[PDB]
Amino acid sequence: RHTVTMIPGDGIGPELMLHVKSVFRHACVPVDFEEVHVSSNADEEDIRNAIMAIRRNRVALKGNIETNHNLPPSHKSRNNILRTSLDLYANVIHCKSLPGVVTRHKDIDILIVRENTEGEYSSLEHESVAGVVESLKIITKAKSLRIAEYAFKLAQESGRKKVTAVHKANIMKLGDGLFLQCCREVAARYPQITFENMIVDNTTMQLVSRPQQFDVMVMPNLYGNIVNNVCAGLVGGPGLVAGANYGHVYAVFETATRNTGKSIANKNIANPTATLLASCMMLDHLKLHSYATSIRKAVLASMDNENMHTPDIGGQGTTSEAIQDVIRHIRVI
Amino acid sequence: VQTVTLIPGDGIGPEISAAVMKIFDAAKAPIQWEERNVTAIQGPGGKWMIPSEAKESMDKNKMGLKGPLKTPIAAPSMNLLLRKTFDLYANVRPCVSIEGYKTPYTDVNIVTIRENTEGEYSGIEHVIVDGVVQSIKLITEGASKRIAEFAFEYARNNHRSNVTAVHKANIMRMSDGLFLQKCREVAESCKDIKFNEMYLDTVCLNMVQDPSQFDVLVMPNLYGDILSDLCAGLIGGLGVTPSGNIGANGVAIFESVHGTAPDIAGKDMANPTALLLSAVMMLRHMGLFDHAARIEAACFATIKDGKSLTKDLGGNAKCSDFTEEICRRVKD
Ligand SMILES: NC(=O)C1=CN([C@@H]2O[C@H](COP(=O)(O)OP(=O)(O)OC[C@H]3O[C@@H](n4cnc5c(N)ncnc54)[C@H](O)[C@@H]3O)[C@@H](O)[C@H]2O)C=CC1
Ligand SMILES: NC(=O)C1=CN([C@@H]2O[C@H](COP(=O)(O)OP(=O)(O)OC[C@H]3O[C@@H](n4cnc5c(N)ncnc54)[C@H](O)[C@@H]3O)[C@@H](O)[C@H]2O)C=CC1
Ligand SMILES: [Mg+2]
């Protein structure tokens, strides 16, 4: 039996965590959840305790922490502190079309590997002259190489064929150029994977017209998480897509996007798919592949039935009813 | 009759400029073209500038229509020079679905308004130590205030009901915080326009699901024009999207957001829709609404019939034929 840190989070996080525990009990999953909370306080003690719990357990499942963008600049983002302190350098998101969820595009299968410790997370802002705010960001060879290293290894091990570096080296000649060159260095050691590059501007335009062309994407921690959110939107939105954060020793699992769903919280309507699929990726990281396959298959089979769909994807079902169908598919196995 | 400065530009530029001149002539538009072929020189010392001839023209005429221009081979672009000379502080990019040209997004009517002097443009990159690169970007109170004022002014003058400020204030607390602060101040004056704030990543998430919710989007330049490009992708791409840059001293330069297209720069192939619709924006900015509506309708009707479309839109026809058919319909 493994012990895993659980951060319930804000909004729909706590209610979705209960449903995960419920699914886990019914599937006889040898995992016990050790809960730590991250409140809205200006004091950093809560997030530091959370980091401490992750160092001990090495693995976490989390809901999403509310960001208040009206608090003083001294109050840094709690999720990003978690990401930098634990050195979770590889953010991995899998946007894949679900047959039963009909959107404007079919046959999307994109793995996005985003650098998750540098770039925007290294940002320093100062107002040393009144009315002038200057920002200073870092891109490095060491962090660019290990993200590229991660994306290619993932590509080869998943039976993928193409890695596309998404960048703005046409404008940021030194920084994004350095990132691009680090991807090229790694590409030389992976002759079975096709390496390509695309300007971020052109990537977003291609995504809304022909997203089928993309396989694996690798990118620095820049351009405001546009690509991840576009791709999440294309396949049906934040209710569906799971995210993972990997370091050399630690791993943290979550929904692809940061939305807490505050306005729909405690109304039994949140889509549980993303969170359930996040817990499956967690199970795979723990080498509990059999349990991951059972739950994942149940989730996807359930999503094939539109009566189980929640309002975010045009359905009329409740969360608890979708959880009921998931548990039913598990018990049949 | 009114004089506007025409910069024909490079590659497909001269072809599409000639096309626009022809449509305007056929529509009996009160426009005369002052051609200015602008190439970078060195004036006082080694400092790069636009020719006096071209500067005198634009300062006088105030209105400019511009084809695409090249990036220099060796390291100071013409677009940068025009931007700094006339202080083009507001980039306006309307995105409207075209009835004839079907994409998976049919309900799009979005105007992006982007700060055009800072962010990406104020940047310096440099090497800290080997394999460590730092970028430095700037946002100011004055420029944020100016773009916010412009966005609400545009919303009034173009019968728009909603202005959404787009930010990443979770990461960029100080700079986007300053942007939102200044947007909020302007919103207090203009209560006739509904104001809201949205995370950039949430805008992108929703845009792709339902672009109909969005009206006017205002943003700083920290991420360049990526959001505008997303919106462009919804309606058919760079071949159809118009753009305007509004500056100091009444100066406004209108242009296509697409490049020179050197691969198809060979005679009679390029889509002139994008430049034409920028010229339509120019007419509206000049108060020539009747000529704007007619030229606009003639272009849309030509696309709707779809029997003489350019190669980029799926047709087999060439530029001059497409141009000729718009000239045909605008006479009525
Ligand atoms: N990058 C970041 O850090 C972001 C943080 N947030 C946080 O979230 C709060 C706002 O909440 P939002 O969720 O943006 O809007 P909201 O509070 O109105 O909640 C409804 C939204 O939740 C989303 N959602 C997420 N997961 C869902 C699920 N499983 N089922 C159904 N709908 C789901 C839907 O897109 C829907 O529009 C903000 O106060 C902020 O703290 C929001 C967006 C980005
Ligand atoms: N505002 C401006 O003056 C801009 C200038 N450029 C310049 O253009 C040059 C090349 O840049 P890229 O982005 O690679 O070029 P681009 O933006 O033209 O690339 C888009 C692609 O779509 C096609 N395309 C573009 N416009 C078209 C039209 N009107 N009709 C039919 N097909 C069209 C082209 O074949 C090209 O492969 C650079 O030197 C750059 O400085 C680029 C963007 C804006
Ligand atoms: Mg662009």
Nearest to A108 by CA among A229, A207, A226: A207
Task: Dump the DSSP string for A136-151.
Answer: EEEEEHHHHHHHHHHH
d(CA A194, CA A191): 7
Say yes or no for a CB contact (<8 Å) between B224 and A259: no
A280/A295 Cα distance (integer angstroms): 7
Q: Which chain A residues are closer than 8 Å to B143 by Cβ?
A: none
Q: What is the largest CA-CA distance in chain A?
A: 67
| Ligand 2 in reach of B276 Cβ (< 6 A) | no
Residue contact A223–B173, C-beta within 8 A: no
* Residue of minimum CA distance from atom 6 in ligand 1: A259
Q: In what order do the strands lie in the sheet with B162-167?
A: B31-35, B2-7, B63-66, B252-256, B242-246, B90-96, B109-115, B216-219, B162-167, B194-199
Q: Best substitution site from B167, B171, B201, B202 to test ligand 1's pocket, by max atoms within 8 Å of Cβ?
A: B202
Residue A126, classed as helix, strand or coil, is: strand
Rounded to a whole number of angstroms, the distance from the CA of A200 to the nearest CA of chain B is 7
- Ligand 2 atom 36, closest CA: B261
Contact status, residue A56 vs residue A4, Cβ threshold 8 Å: no
Q: How far is CA B204 from CA A261, B199, B217, in A?
A: 17, 9, 12
Q: What is the residue type of A80?
A: N
Task: List, in order, residues 6 or more apart from B288 with CB less than 8 Å away.
Answer: B29, B30
Q: Using CA atoms, how far apart are residues A324 and A331, in angstroms rounded to an integer? A: 11
Distance CA B12, CA B18 (A): 10
- With beta carbons under 8 A apart, name residues in chain B contacting A133: 138-140, 174-175, 178
CA A122, distance to chain mean position in Å, is 19
Show residues of chain B in contact with A145, CB under 8 Å: none
Across the interface, whether the CB atoms of B202 and A206 are under 8 A apart is answered no
Cβ(B119) to ligand 2 under 6 A?
Answer: no
> Which phi and psi (to 5°) does residue B302 adopt?
-65, -40
Is A312 annotated to bind ligand?
Answer: no
- Strands B31-35 and A119-129, by their bridges, are unpaired
Residue type, A215: D
Give the resolution value in Å: 2.4
Pick the CATH number of B1-332 from 3.90.1170.50, 3.40.1160.10, 3.40.718.10, 3.40.630.30: 3.40.718.10
User: Which ranges of chain A does DSSP label H, i.e. alpha helix?
Assistant: 13-26, 45-57, 78-85, 141-157, 175-187, 200-207, 226-234, 273-285, 289-303, 319-331
> Which parts of A27-77 fold into alpha helices (H)?
45-57
DSSP annotation of B115: E
- Centre a 10 Å sphere on the Cβ of residue A16 and count the other Cβ atoms it contains: 28
Ligand 1 pocket list (CB less than 6 A): A 12, 66-67, 237-239, 258-264, 270-271, 274, 312; B 170, 199, 201-202
Q: Is A78 annotated as a binding residue?
A: no
Task: Provide the residue type at B62 as one letter.
Answer: K
Main-chain phi, psi angles of A131, to 5 degrees: 80, 10
What are the two backbone dihedrals, phi and then psi, of residue B238, each rounded to the nearest 5 degrees?
-70, -25
Name the residue among B170, B225, B230 with its Cβ closest to that of A230. Answer: B230
Rounded distance between C-alpha atoms, residue B263 and residue A184, angstroms = 26
The domain ranges of chain B are 1-332
Is B165 exposed, middle or buried, given 0-12, 13-18 or 19+ CB atoms closer than 10 A? Answer: buried
Helix axes B13-26, B289-305, angle to 10 degrees: 110
- The number of beta carbons lying within 10 Å of the beta carbon of residue A309 is 22
Contact B67, B7 (CB under 8 A): yes
CATH of the domain at A248: 3.40.718.10
Asked if A92 contacts A113 with a C-beta cutoff of 8 angstroms, the reply is: yes
Q: Please report residues of B whose CB lies closer than 8 A to that of A137.
A: 134-135, 137
Q: Quick check: helix, strand or coil at residue A104? A: coil
What is the Cα–Cα distance from B108 to B211, expressed in whole angstroms? 6
**DSSP sequence for B44-99:** STT-EE--HHHHHHHHHH-EEEE---PPPS----HHHHHHHHTT--EEEEEEE--S
Q: Which residues, including other chains, have CB under 8 Å from residue A215's CB and lie 6 or more apart?
A: A109, A110, A111, A155, A160, A161, A162, A163, A164
Q: Give A6 Cα–ligand 3 centroid separation in angstroms.
A: 41
Interface test with A, best of B171, B179, B183 (most A CBs within 10 A): B171
Residue type, B305: D
d(CA A166, CA A121): 18
CA of B278 to the centre of ligand 2 (A): 15
- Amino acid letter, B259: G
User: φ and ψ at A178, to 5 degrees?
Assistant: -60, -45
Pocket lining: B15 vs ligand 2, CB cutoff 6 Å:
no
In this structure, which amino acid lies at residue B314?
Answer: G
Distances (CA, A) of A46 to A36, A50, A173, B56: 8, 6, 40, 63
